[PDB]
């Protein structure tokens, strides 16, 4: 039973890392389509100078 709990914890942590990295990568994706107003460029590389 202890190993089953620990196994759930380990699966959760692995998923957290996957979610965390996906979130982190969302900050680097250039919104191709002009339309979406919402995603304000965070980086100057994406800045439309």
């Amino acid at each position: 039973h202890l190993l089953r709990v620990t196994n759930k914890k380990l699966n959760h942590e692995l998923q957290s890392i996957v979610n965390g990295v996906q979130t982190l990568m969302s900050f680097f994706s250039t919104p191709e389509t002009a339309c979406e107003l919402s995603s304000q460029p965070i980086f100057l590389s994406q800045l439309l100078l």
């Binding site: 202890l2 190993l3 620990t6 914890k9 380990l10 942590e13 890392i17």
Partner: protein, 51 residues
């Protein structure tokens, strides 16, 4: 002598080998040790997620 031989066969048959209980104890200990190692590994992944 026939009675003694019957009783002997019974004792030999009762030779309590608690090997099953002992096996379970061994497995339990090994798995406990395994659990401890896996908990250390979970703590290490938790630290990476914080970062």
């Amino acid at each position: 002598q026939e009675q003694i031989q019957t009783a002997e066969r019974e004792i030999v048959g009762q030779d309590l080998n608690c090997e099953r209980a002992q096996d379970l104890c061994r497995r339990s200990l090994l798995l406990r040790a395994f659990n401890k190692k896996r908990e250390e590994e979970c703590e290490a992944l938790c630290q990476s997620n914080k970062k």
